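hey
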């Protein structure tokens, strides 16, 4: 099966894309792997806008780099454009977040305290100090009432690895 990404690269005349390949051709000019940067692995992963854990990053290479390079080569360079238009598309969705607080409710009411959140980070094995949660909750709850309702939930998931 073909894709709109690889379809464009094959459609771009060698002479046409050559004019755009003069940009990356500069960096790679002094490279042996053919990539633009040796540690570009962390940069290419940013193009997707998702870096929850360093363990999952290794999976990204197998999600986009079927070859196993970890960098945007001459071929990927052309796709880097059509791939940069992936905006307006994240991992979590309002549809999930809705069932998230609902499914993660031991009392099933609509509010999620600070403890209810710990169970989430606990699943990974991590652990913070009482000073982190105390200050953290202050953010999750714009009203700092005591729990995280629907509206509050949407905010609590505004930014936090």
């Amino acid at each position: 099966m073909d894709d709109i990404y690889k379809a464009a690269v094959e459609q771009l005349t060698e002479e046409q894309k050559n004019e755009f390949k003069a940009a990356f051709d500069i960096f790679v000019l002094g490279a042996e792997d053919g990539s633009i940067s040796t540690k570009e692995l962390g940069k290419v992963m940013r193009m997707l806008g998702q870096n929850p854990t360093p363990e999952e990053l290794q999976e990204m290479i197998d999600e986009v780099d079927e070859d196993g390079s970890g960098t945007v080569d001459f071929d990927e360079f052309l796709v880097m454009m059509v791939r940069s238009m992936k905006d307006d598309s994240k991992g979590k969705s309002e549809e999930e977040l809705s069932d998230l607080f609902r499914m993660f409710d031991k009392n099933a009411d609509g509010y999620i305290d600070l403890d209810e959140l710990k169970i989430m980070l606990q699943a990974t094995g991590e652990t913070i100090t009482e000073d982190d949660i105390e200050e953290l909750m202050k953010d999750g709850d714009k009203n700092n009432d005591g729990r995280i309702d629907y509206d509050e939930w949407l905010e609590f998931m505004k930014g936090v690895e």
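The chain has two domains: 1-88, 89-161. The radius of gyration is 22 Å.
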